[PDB]
Amino acid sequence: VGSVAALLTVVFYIAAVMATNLYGATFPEWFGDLSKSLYTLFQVMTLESWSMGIVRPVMNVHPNAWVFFIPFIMLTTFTVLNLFIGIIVDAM
Amino acid sequence: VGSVAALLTVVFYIAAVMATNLYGATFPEWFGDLSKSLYTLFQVMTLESWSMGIVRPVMNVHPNAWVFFIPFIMLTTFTVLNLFIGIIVDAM
Amino acid sequence: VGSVAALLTVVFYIAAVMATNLYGATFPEWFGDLSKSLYTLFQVMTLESWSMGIVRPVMNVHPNAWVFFIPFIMLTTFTVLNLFIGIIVDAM
Amino acid sequence: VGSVAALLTVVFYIAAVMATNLYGATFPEWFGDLSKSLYTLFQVMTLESWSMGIVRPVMNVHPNAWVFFIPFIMLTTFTVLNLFIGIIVDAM
Ligand SMILES: [Br-]
Ligand SMILES: [Br-]
Ligand code: NA
Ligand code: NA
Ligand code: NA
């Protein structure tokens, strides 16, 4: 469980650094600093307004933004589910 | 199953009291009384418009609001999933 | 699996009849006929805009609407998850 | 796991071709080409704004659009969950 939880933290910090660099200047409310980026990527992970609210407005400036966000979703959504199931099975 | 269901009820009432106190005055439609608070925190748990609809408007007045909401989500989303899986396994 | 799938169909039709009757006149686009109601309740089940998009506008006319929708969500979200897990385990 | 992952890829490409053909002319931002279609159908799968954001605007032009989208959701949401659970069990 600890290895999976540490993997997600490292992935979350690398992604939030990457997103600050890529979309910070063009989208400062969502990715203007590391803290705004970490909060936004958490929102993207929970799936909340990920496309209509964040990704589509971003893609109008950065067409390839889907190469960042879609894999981020596919990985974090799998890892979180694997972490929760892992913690539940270990507690049993 | 009963212990997990009781844990969530106690956590839900403490959070909705806390939210009434913190955000009630500045956001009365969402946290103006305990009943509005319990409804909103349920909506936050289901992930529905949690960030674009509630948390981002709140953070514009209370910058640290994420310290309340993010852990609330992480805990309730884990507990509910643990309660549903627990009820399914016990029925088998 | 068949018993769970039949339980959800009966619950979905009873709810969609109830919602047509209760909210049809005041909210015709969402519950004006049985077909619009069945579609809306499916959207409510997937959690999509359930509160900001449907339930909050409804509650402004019908304050108690949460007594219908919250249990509907709690039941269908549990049943669907139980049906999917049940179908997966039976296939193994 | 490989058979389930290949089934989803074939289903995703057939659906995105079908959606390009059906809704491309009337809704070009969402289904104007295969690339836009594949992105939108992924967003529909994650449940993000599927009804208020995409399906309801589409249904105002194509009333039967629900015959495409509802089964697409029911199938992909089941398959993805079956793929993730399958990958987790195989890793154990
Ligand atoms: Br989470
Ligand atoms: Br479903
Ligand atoms: Na959602
Ligand atoms: Na969801
Ligand atoms: Na939403």
Side-chain angles (χ1 to χ4, degrees), chain C residues 11-50:
Chain C
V11 153
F12 228 87
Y13 272 79
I14 289 161
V17 161
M18 284 193 84
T20 308
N21 186 248
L22 293 164
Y23 324 118
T26 44
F27 298 90
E29 279 275 38
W30 309 324
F31 315 95
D33 49 75
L34 183 63
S35 77
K36 289 167 171 184
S37 280
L38 285 157
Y39 170 86
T40 304
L41 291 165
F42 175 78
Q43 173 201 327
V44 173
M45 186 182 79
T46 62
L47 307 169
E48 204 284 288
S49 291
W50 84 258

mmCIF file of all heavy atoms in Angstrom, chain C residues 11-50:
data_model
loop_
_atom_site.group_PDB
_atom_site.id
_atom_site.type_symbol
_atom_site.label_atom_id
_atom_site.label_comp_id
_atom_site.label_asym_id
_atom_site.label_seq_id
_atom_site.Cartn_x
_atom_site.Cartn_y
_atom_site.Cartn_z
ATOM 1 N N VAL C 11 -37.493 -0.562 -10.008
ATOM 2 C CA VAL C 11 -37.180 0.646 -9.234
ATOM 3 C C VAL C 11 -37.074 1.870 -10.166
ATOM 4 O O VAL C 11 -37.601 2.931 -9.833
ATOM 5 C CB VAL C 11 -35.922 0.428 -8.338
ATOM 6 C CG1 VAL C 11 -35.172 1.731 -8.040
ATOM 7 C CG2 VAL C 11 -36.295 -0.295 -7.045
ATOM 8 N N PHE C 12 -36.438 1.699 -11.340
ATOM 9 C CA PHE C 12 -36.277 2.756 -12.336
ATOM 10 C C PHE C 12 -37.590 3.195 -12.959
ATOM 11 O O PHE C 12 -37.759 4.380 -13.236
ATOM 12 C CB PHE C 12 -35.290 2.338 -13.436
ATOM 13 C CG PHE C 12 -34.262 3.396 -13.722
ATOM 14 C CD1 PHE C 12 -33.083 3.453 -12.995
ATOM 15 C CD2 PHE C 12 -34.492 4.366 -14.690
ATOM 16 C CE1 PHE C 12 -32.153 4.460 -13.229
ATOM 17 C CE2 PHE C 12 -33.563 5.376 -14.918
ATOM 18 C CZ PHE C 12 -32.400 5.413 -14.187
ATOM 19 N N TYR C 13 -38.506 2.254 -13.199
ATOM 20 C CA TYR C 13 -39.798 2.595 -13.768
ATOM 21 C C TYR C 13 -40.734 3.259 -12.757
ATOM 22 O O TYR C 13 -41.406 4.226 -13.125
ATOM 23 C CB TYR C 13 -40.418 1.409 -14.513
ATOM 24 C CG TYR C 13 -39.971 1.370 -15.956
ATOM 25 C CD1 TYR C 13 -38.715 0.876 -16.307
ATOM 26 C CD2 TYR C 13 -40.774 1.889 -16.968
ATOM 27 C CE1 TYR C 13 -38.278 0.881 -17.632
ATOM 28 C CE2 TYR C 13 -40.354 1.883 -18.300
ATOM 29 C CZ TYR C 13 -39.105 1.381 -18.626
ATOM 30 O OH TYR C 13 -38.692 1.376 -19.939
ATOM 31 N N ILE C 14 -40.723 2.794 -11.479
ATOM 32 C CA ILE C 14 -41.525 3.366 -10.387
ATOM 33 C C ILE C 14 -41.072 4.796 -10.078
ATOM 34 O O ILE C 14 -41.924 5.676 -9.950
ATOM 35 C CB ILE C 14 -41.605 2.430 -9.145
ATOM 36 C CG1 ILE C 14 -42.497 1.207 -9.468
ATOM 37 C CG2 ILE C 14 -42.127 3.169 -7.888
ATOM 38 C CD1 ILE C 14 -42.319 -0.006 -8.561
ATOM 39 N N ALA C 15 -39.748 5.032 -10.018
ATOM 40 C CA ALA C 15 -39.168 6.348 -9.781
ATOM 41 C C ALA C 15 -39.513 7.324 -10.900
ATOM 42 O O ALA C 15 -39.898 8.455 -10.608
ATOM 43 C CB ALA C 15 -37.661 6.234 -9.641
ATOM 44 N N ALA C 16 -39.382 6.885 -12.183
ATOM 45 C CA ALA C 16 -39.666 7.713 -13.354
ATOM 46 C C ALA C 16 -41.122 8.079 -13.499
ATOM 47 O O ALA C 16 -41.398 9.174 -13.972
ATOM 48 C CB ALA C 16 -39.140 7.071 -14.598
ATOM 49 N N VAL C 17 -42.046 7.214 -13.025
ATOM 50 C CA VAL C 17 -43.491 7.473 -12.949
ATOM 51 C C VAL C 17 -43.702 8.554 -11.844
ATOM 52 O O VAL C 17 -44.360 9.569 -12.090
ATOM 53 C CB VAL C 17 -44.287 6.158 -12.658
ATOM 54 C CG1 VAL C 17 -45.685 6.434 -12.112
ATOM 55 C CG2 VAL C 17 -44.369 5.272 -13.894
ATOM 56 N N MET C 18 -43.105 8.336 -10.651
ATOM 57 C CA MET C 18 -43.189 9.244 -9.505
ATOM 58 C C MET C 18 -42.685 10.639 -9.843
ATOM 59 O O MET C 18 -43.337 11.624 -9.485
ATOM 60 C CB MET C 18 -42.399 8.695 -8.310
ATOM 61 C CG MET C 18 -43.077 7.561 -7.586
ATOM 62 S SD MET C 18 -42.245 7.265 -6.000
ATOM 63 C CE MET C 18 -43.054 8.504 -4.962
ATOM 64 N N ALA C 19 -41.515 10.727 -10.518
ATOM 65 C CA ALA C 19 -40.892 11.993 -10.899
ATOM 66 C C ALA C 19 -41.741 12.752 -11.948
ATOM 67 O O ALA C 19 -41.878 13.970 -11.805
ATOM 68 C CB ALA C 19 -39.475 11.762 -11.382
ATOM 69 N N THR C 20 -42.369 12.028 -12.945
ATOM 70 C CA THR C 20 -43.272 12.598 -13.964
ATOM 71 C C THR C 20 -44.434 13.311 -13.251
ATOM 72 O O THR C 20 -44.793 14.439 -13.596
ATOM 73 C CB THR C 20 -43.890 11.490 -14.864
ATOM 74 O OG1 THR C 20 -42.889 10.640 -15.399
ATOM 75 C CG2 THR C 20 -44.723 12.051 -16.013
ATOM 76 N N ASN C 21 -45.009 12.633 -12.244
ATOM 77 C CA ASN C 21 -46.139 13.120 -11.466
ATOM 78 C C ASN C 21 -45.786 14.325 -10.601
ATOM 79 O O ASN C 21 -46.537 15.303 -10.573
ATOM 80 C CB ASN C 21 -46.738 11.991 -10.612
ATOM 81 C CG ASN C 21 -48.004 12.389 -9.895
ATOM 82 O OD1 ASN C 21 -48.043 12.501 -8.655
ATOM 83 N ND2 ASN C 21 -49.053 12.668 -10.665
ATOM 84 N N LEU C 22 -44.663 14.249 -9.895
ATOM 85 C CA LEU C 22 -44.245 15.288 -8.973
ATOM 86 C C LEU C 22 -43.712 16.563 -9.634
ATOM 87 O O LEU C 22 -44.169 17.668 -9.299
ATOM 88 C CB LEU C 22 -43.223 14.728 -7.940
ATOM 89 C CG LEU C 22 -43.742 13.684 -6.937
ATOM 90 C CD1 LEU C 22 -42.613 12.963 -6.281
ATOM 91 C CD2 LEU C 22 -44.638 14.314 -5.887
ATOM 92 N N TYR C 23 -42.749 16.408 -10.563
ATOM 93 C CA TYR C 23 -42.018 17.518 -11.166
ATOM 94 C C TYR C 23 -42.296 17.819 -12.630
ATOM 95 O O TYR C 23 -41.697 18.742 -13.179
ATOM 96 C CB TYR C 23 -40.529 17.287 -10.942
ATOM 97 C CG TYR C 23 -40.177 16.647 -9.612
ATOM 98 C CD1 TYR C 23 -39.549 15.403 -9.559
ATOM 99 C CD2 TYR C 23 -40.432 17.303 -8.408
ATOM 100 C CE1 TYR C 23 -39.196 14.822 -8.340
ATOM 101 C CE2 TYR C 23 -40.083 16.732 -7.184
ATOM 102 C CZ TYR C 23 -39.454 15.496 -7.156
ATOM 103 O OH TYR C 23 -39.110 14.932 -5.954
ATOM 104 N N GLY C 24 -43.197 17.050 -13.246
ATOM 105 C CA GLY C 24 -43.556 17.194 -14.647
ATOM 106 C C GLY C 24 -44.068 18.561 -15.024
ATOM 107 O O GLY C 24 -43.562 19.146 -15.975
ATOM 108 N N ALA C 25 -45.033 19.098 -14.264
ATOM 109 C CA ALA C 25 -45.665 20.386 -14.575
ATOM 110 C C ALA C 25 -44.758 21.600 -14.405
ATOM 111 O O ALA C 25 -44.799 22.530 -15.213
ATOM 112 C CB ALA C 25 -46.927 20.561 -13.759
ATOM 113 N N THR C 26 -43.940 21.579 -13.353
ATOM 114 C CA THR C 26 -43.013 22.649 -12.977
ATOM 115 C C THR C 26 -41.669 22.595 -13.707
ATOM 116 O O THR C 26 -41.019 23.636 -13.859
ATOM 117 C CB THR C 26 -42.876 22.704 -11.451
ATOM 118 O OG1 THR C 26 -42.730 21.372 -10.961
ATOM 119 C CG2 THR C 26 -44.074 23.335 -10.794
ATOM 120 N N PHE C 27 -41.243 21.381 -14.134
ATOM 121 C CA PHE C 27 -39.993 21.119 -14.854
ATOM 122 C C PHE C 27 -40.269 20.179 -16.078
ATOM 123 O O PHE C 27 -39.803 19.036 -16.087
ATOM 124 C CB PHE C 27 -38.926 20.555 -13.876
ATOM 125 C CG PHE C 27 -38.570 21.518 -12.760
ATOM 126 C CD1 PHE C 27 -39.271 21.510 -11.557
ATOM 127 C CD2 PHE C 27 -37.566 22.464 -12.929
ATOM 128 C CE1 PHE C 27 -38.999 22.458 -10.561
ATOM 129 C CE2 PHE C 27 -37.285 23.400 -11.926
ATOM 130 C CZ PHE C 27 -38.012 23.401 -10.756
ATOM 131 N N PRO C 28 -41.075 20.624 -17.096
ATOM 132 C CA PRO C 28 -41.380 19.756 -18.251
ATOM 133 C C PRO C 28 -40.235 19.207 -19.122
ATOM 134 O O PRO C 28 -40.438 18.134 -19.702
ATOM 135 C CB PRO C 28 -42.347 20.607 -19.067
ATOM 136 C CG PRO C 28 -42.033 21.983 -18.704
ATOM 137 C CD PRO C 28 -41.778 21.914 -17.243
ATOM 138 N N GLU C 29 -39.075 19.926 -19.277
ATOM 139 C CA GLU C 29 -37.939 19.421 -20.104
ATOM 140 C C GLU C 29 -37.293 18.204 -19.489
ATOM 141 O O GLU C 29 -36.868 17.311 -20.207
ATOM 142 C CB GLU C 29 -36.843 20.476 -20.313
ATOM 143 C CG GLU C 29 -37.180 21.454 -21.418
ATOM 144 C CD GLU C 29 -36.865 21.112 -22.864
ATOM 145 O OE1 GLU C 29 -37.002 19.940 -23.288
ATOM 146 O OE2 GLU C 29 -36.546 22.067 -23.604
ATOM 147 N N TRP C 30 -37.238 18.163 -18.144
ATOM 148 C CA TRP C 30 -36.631 17.059 -17.413
ATOM 149 C C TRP C 30 -37.577 15.957 -16.986
ATOM 150 O O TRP C 30 -37.136 14.810 -16.951
ATOM 151 C CB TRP C 30 -35.837 17.564 -16.218
ATOM 152 C CG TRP C 30 -34.855 18.665 -16.514
ATOM 153 C CD1 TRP C 30 -34.097 18.823 -17.639
ATOM 154 C CD2 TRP C 30 -34.448 19.704 -15.606
ATOM 155 N NE1 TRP C 30 -33.271 19.921 -17.503
ATOM 156 C CE2 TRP C 30 -33.472 20.481 -16.266
ATOM 157 C CE3 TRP C 30 -34.835 20.067 -14.306
ATOM 158 C CZ2 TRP C 30 -32.873 21.594 -15.665
ATOM 159 C CZ3 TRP C 30 -34.237 21.169 -13.711
ATOM 160 C CH2 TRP C 30 -33.274 21.922 -14.389
ATOM 161 N N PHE C 31 -38.861 16.264 -16.676
ATOM 162 C CA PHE C 31 -39.799 15.227 -16.206
ATOM 163 C C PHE C 31 -41.241 15.303 -16.777
ATOM 164 O O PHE C 31 -42.160 14.712 -16.201
ATOM 165 C CB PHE C 31 -39.830 15.178 -14.657
ATOM 166 C CG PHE C 31 -38.515 15.222 -13.903
ATOM 167 C CD1 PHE C 31 -38.012 16.430 -13.414
ATOM 168 C CD2 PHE C 31 -37.806 14.056 -13.637
ATOM 169 C CE1 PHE C 31 -36.824 16.467 -12.667
ATOM 170 C CE2 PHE C 31 -36.609 14.098 -12.904
ATOM 171 C CZ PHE C 31 -36.126 15.305 -12.429
ATOM 172 N N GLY C 32 -41.406 15.981 -17.920
ATOM 173 C CA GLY C 32 -42.694 16.187 -18.598
ATOM 174 C C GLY C 32 -43.446 14.978 -19.130
ATOM 175 O O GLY C 32 -44.640 15.074 -19.404
ATOM 176 N N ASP C 33 -42.746 13.872 -19.365
ATOM 177 C CA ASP C 33 -43.309 12.598 -19.791
ATOM 178 C C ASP C 33 -42.484 11.463 -19.179
ATOM 179 O O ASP C 33 -41.495 11.747 -18.505
ATOM 180 C CB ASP C 33 -43.519 12.494 -21.324
ATOM 181 C CG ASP C 33 -42.379 12.865 -22.259
ATOM 182 O OD1 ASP C 33 -41.430 12.075 -22.370
ATOM 183 O OD2 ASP C 33 -42.524 13.858 -23.014
ATOM 184 N N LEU C 34 -42.912 10.197 -19.326
ATOM 185 C CA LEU C 34 -42.164 9.080 -18.732
ATOM 186 C C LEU C 34 -40.751 8.945 -19.340
ATOM 187 O O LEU C 34 -39.796 8.751 -18.585
ATOM 188 C CB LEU C 34 -42.966 7.755 -18.810
ATOM 189 C CG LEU C 34 -42.356 6.482 -18.176
ATOM 190 C CD1 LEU C 34 -42.175 6.614 -16.675
ATOM 191 C CD2 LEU C 34 -43.227 5.276 -18.455
ATOM 192 N N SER C 35 -40.627 9.106 -20.684
ATOM 193 C CA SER C 35 -39.369 9.010 -21.444
ATOM 194 C C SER C 35 -38.300 10.029 -21.021
ATOM 195 O O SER C 35 -37.143 9.643 -20.853
ATOM 196 C CB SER C 35 -39.628 9.067 -22.947
ATOM 197 O OG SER C 35 -39.887 10.386 -23.397
ATOM 198 N N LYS C 36 -38.692 11.314 -20.827
ATOM 199 C CA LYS C 36 -37.820 12.404 -20.363
ATOM 200 C C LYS C 36 -37.343 12.102 -18.953
ATOM 201 O O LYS C 36 -36.168 12.333 -18.659
ATOM 202 C CB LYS C 36 -38.569 13.742 -20.359
ATOM 203 C CG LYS C 36 -38.868 14.335 -21.726
ATOM 204 C CD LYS C 36 -39.864 15.463 -21.559
ATOM 205 C CE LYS C 36 -40.122 16.316 -22.777
ATOM 206 N NZ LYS C 36 -41.053 17.440 -22.445
ATOM 207 N N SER C 37 -38.264 11.579 -18.085
ATOM 208 C CA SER C 37 -38.037 11.191 -16.678
ATOM 209 C C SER C 37 -37.019 10.052 -16.561
ATOM 210 O O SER C 37 -36.089 10.169 -15.764
ATOM 211 C CB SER C 37 -39.345 10.787 -15.997
ATOM 212 O OG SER C 37 -40.120 11.894 -15.565
ATOM 213 N N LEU C 38 -37.185 8.963 -17.371
ATOM 214 C CA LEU C 38 -36.272 7.799 -17.412
ATOM 215 C C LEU C 38 -34.845 8.200 -17.813
ATOM 216 O O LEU C 38 -33.882 7.715 -17.213
ATOM 217 C CB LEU C 38 -36.802 6.674 -18.333
ATOM 218 C CG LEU C 38 -37.968 5.833 -17.779
ATOM 219 C CD1 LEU C 38 -38.743 5.180 -18.899
ATOM 220 C CD2 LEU C 38 -37.491 4.786 -16.767
ATOM 221 N N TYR C 39 -34.725 9.115 -18.802
ATOM 222 C CA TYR C 39 -33.464 9.668 -19.288
ATOM 223 C C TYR C 39 -32.785 10.512 -18.185
ATOM 224 O O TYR C 39 -31.568 10.402 -17.985
ATOM 225 C CB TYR C 39 -33.696 10.516 -20.566
ATOM 226 C CG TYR C 39 -32.473 11.305 -20.990
ATOM 227 C CD1 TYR C 39 -31.497 10.734 -21.803
ATOM 228 C CD2 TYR C 39 -32.256 12.601 -20.522
ATOM 229 C CE1 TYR C 39 -30.345 11.436 -22.154
ATOM 230 C CE2 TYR C 39 -31.102 13.305 -20.853
ATOM 231 C CZ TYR C 39 -30.151 12.722 -21.676
ATOM 232 O OH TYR C 39 -29.030 13.429 -22.045
ATOM 233 N N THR C 40 -33.573 11.387 -17.518
ATOM 234 C CA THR C 40 -33.087 12.274 -16.465
ATOM 235 C C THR C 40 -32.614 11.451 -15.274
ATOM 236 O O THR C 40 -31.509 11.679 -14.800
ATOM 237 C CB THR C 40 -34.140 13.338 -16.126
ATOM 238 O OG1 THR C 40 -34.478 14.039 -17.319
ATOM 239 C CG2 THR C 40 -33.663 14.336 -15.091
ATOM 240 N N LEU C 41 -33.412 10.458 -14.828
ATOM 241 C CA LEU C 41 -33.016 9.600 -13.704
ATOM 242 C C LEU C 41 -31.779 8.767 -13.992
ATOM 243 O O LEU C 41 -31.003 8.488 -13.070
ATOM 244 C CB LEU C 41 -34.164 8.764 -13.159
ATOM 245 C CG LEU C 41 -35.232 9.555 -12.441
ATOM 246 C CD1 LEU C 41 -36.440 8.726 -12.268
ATOM 247 C CD2 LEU C 41 -34.744 10.075 -11.086
ATOM 248 N N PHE C 42 -31.548 8.430 -15.275
ATOM 249 C CA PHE C 42 -30.324 7.733 -15.669
ATOM 250 C C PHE C 42 -29.146 8.692 -15.462
ATOM 251 O O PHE C 42 -28.151 8.288 -14.865
ATOM 252 C CB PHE C 42 -30.385 7.209 -17.118
ATOM 253 C CG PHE C 42 -29.083 6.583 -17.581
ATOM 254 C CD1 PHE C 42 -28.730 5.295 -17.186
ATOM 255 C CD2 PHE C 42 -28.200 7.290 -18.389
ATOM 256 C CE1 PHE C 42 -27.521 4.726 -17.594
ATOM 257 C CE2 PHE C 42 -26.988 6.723 -18.791
ATOM 258 C CZ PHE C 42 -26.660 5.443 -18.396
ATOM 259 N N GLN C 43 -29.290 9.967 -15.924
ATOM 260 C CA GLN C 43 -28.299 11.036 -15.770
ATOM 261 C C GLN C 43 -28.016 11.279 -14.276
ATOM 262 O O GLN C 43 -26.856 11.440 -13.895
ATOM 263 C CB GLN C 43 -28.779 12.322 -16.468
ATOM 264 C CG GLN C 43 -27.880 13.522 -16.204
ATOM 265 C CD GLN C 43 -28.537 14.852 -16.430
ATOM 266 O OE1 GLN C 43 -29.395 15.016 -17.307
ATOM 267 N NE2 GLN C 43 -28.078 15.854 -15.687
ATOM 268 N N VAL C 44 -29.066 11.260 -13.439
ATOM 269 C CA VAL C 44 -28.948 11.429 -11.987
ATOM 270 C C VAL C 44 -28.132 10.252 -11.415
ATOM 271 O O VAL C 44 -27.225 10.475 -10.610
ATOM 272 C CB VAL C 44 -30.322 11.648 -11.285
ATOM 273 C CG1 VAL C 44 -30.182 11.649 -9.757
ATOM 274 C CG2 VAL C 44 -30.972 12.953 -11.749
ATOM 275 N N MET C 45 -28.393 9.021 -11.901
ATOM 276 C CA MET C 45 -27.662 7.825 -11.478
ATOM 277 C C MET C 45 -26.160 7.903 -11.806
ATOM 278 O O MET C 45 -25.354 7.537 -10.953
ATOM 279 C CB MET C 45 -28.303 6.567 -12.072
ATOM 280 C CG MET C 45 -27.693 5.283 -11.564
ATOM 281 S SD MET C 45 -28.445 3.841 -12.321
ATOM 282 C CE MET C 45 -27.610 3.833 -13.942
ATOM 283 N N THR C 46 -25.785 8.403 -13.012
ATOM 284 C CA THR C 46 -24.374 8.545 -13.437
ATOM 285 C C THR C 46 -23.681 9.700 -12.687
ATOM 286 O O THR C 46 -22.470 9.894 -12.820
ATOM 287 C CB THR C 46 -24.254 8.710 -14.965
ATOM 288 O OG1 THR C 46 -24.930 9.904 -15.367
ATOM 289 C CG2 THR C 46 -24.759 7.494 -15.739
ATOM 290 N N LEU C 47 -24.485 10.462 -11.906
ATOM 291 C CA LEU C 47 -24.135 11.607 -11.056
ATOM 292 C C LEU C 47 -23.958 12.919 -11.806
ATOM 293 O O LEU C 47 -23.820 13.955 -11.178
ATOM 294 C CB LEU C 47 -22.988 11.300 -10.067
ATOM 295 C CG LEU C 47 -23.184 10.059 -9.186
ATOM 296 C CD1 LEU C 47 -21.918 9.702 -8.460
ATOM 297 C CD2 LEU C 47 -24.329 10.246 -8.195
ATOM 298 N N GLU C 48 -24.061 12.887 -13.140
ATOM 299 C CA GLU C 48 -23.871 14.040 -14.015
ATOM 300 C C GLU C 48 -24.830 15.189 -13.721
ATOM 301 O O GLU C 48 -26.027 15.014 -13.846
ATOM 302 C CB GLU C 48 -23.920 13.595 -15.490
ATOM 303 C CG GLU C 48 -23.193 14.526 -16.445
ATOM 304 C CD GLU C 48 -23.912 15.815 -16.785
ATOM 305 O OE1 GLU C 48 -24.914 15.766 -17.526
ATOM 306 O OE2 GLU C 48 -23.460 16.882 -16.326
ATOM 307 N N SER C 49 -24.297 16.354 -13.325
ATOM 308 C CA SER C 49 -25.029 17.591 -12.979
ATOM 309 C C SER C 49 -26.276 17.373 -12.111
ATOM 310 O O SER C 49 -27.246 18.136 -12.211
ATOM 311 C CB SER C 49 -25.388 18.384 -14.232
ATOM 312 O OG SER C 49 -24.257 18.942 -14.874
ATOM 313 N N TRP C 50 -26.267 16.317 -11.283
ATOM 314 C CA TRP C 50 -27.430 15.948 -10.490
ATOM 315 C C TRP C 50 -27.909 17.054 -9.564
ATOM 316 O O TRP C 50 -29.100 17.298 -9.493
ATOM 317 C CB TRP C 50 -27.235 14.586 -9.793
ATOM 318 C CG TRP C 50 -26.493 14.614 -8.482
ATOM 319 C CD1 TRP C 50 -25.194 14.264 -8.269
ATOM 320 C CD2 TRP C 50 -27.041 14.920 -7.187
ATOM 321 N NE1 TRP C 50 -24.881 14.386 -6.931
ATOM 322 C CE2 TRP C 50 -25.997 14.790 -6.246
ATOM 323 C CE3 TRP C 50 -28.314 15.309 -6.731
ATOM 324 C CZ2 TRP C 50 -26.189 15.021 -4.875
ATOM 325 C CZ3 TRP C 50 -28.498 15.554 -5.369
ATOM 326 C CH2 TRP C 50 -27.454 15.385 -4.457
#
